[PDB]
Amino acid sequence: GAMGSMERASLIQKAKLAEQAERYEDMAAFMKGAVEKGEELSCEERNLLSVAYKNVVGGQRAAWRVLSSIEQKSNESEEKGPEVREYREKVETELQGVCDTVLGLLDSHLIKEAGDAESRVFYLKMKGDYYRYLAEVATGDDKKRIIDSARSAYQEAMDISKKEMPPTNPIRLGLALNFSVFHYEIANSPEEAISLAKTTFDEAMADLHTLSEDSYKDSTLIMQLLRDNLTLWT
């Protein structure tokens, strides 16, 4: 890897600089290099890893949706040749490559070394997320297997989070939020999505009284996203 010669601490320092500069492709390459040093990641470092790749894949997802929309209109009317499909495929392939890279880092060897609930749930949620992003563009004979891989990762993360974390924990909340999005947008299960969002919100509400002002702010921020989705979905 091109980052093999750089110190771990320097990679982390430069990841933070790249974030400030909104250079998320650089940020992701720096954090990939940091992961490949082989040491476990701290809470802050896990968040840097997620911020970097979420922004990279976020740009690819937005582009893919634009191109896919154009492609579907073309098939309603004038023929224009293969270019729209070709370029949609180009972006799609790049997106799939980023997802495969993240999933590879989780499998080699972030997840197997993660023993604390906060790290293990964070990484398993990430695994579900990037299989979900793959599912968003999947159309062939492995769409079903991609969907079940996302579901399986989310479910393992959910089981741990319910046993080991309070209902207001932001990682637990963000996991439940994203699993509910998986149900609604990927798995054709809107009722499951709604039920999960409502129970997650209500169980967090009842635990807010235990929190400091700062933790209350962290938790209510994610709870509002659950509420926004319920308003969209009902």
Binding site: D129, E185, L225
Partner: peptide, 10 residues
């Protein structure tokens, strides 16, 4: 589309 989680979680 639905809202998903921010990347950074405490």
């Amino acid at each position: 589309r639905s809202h998903s989680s921010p990347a950074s979680l405490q």
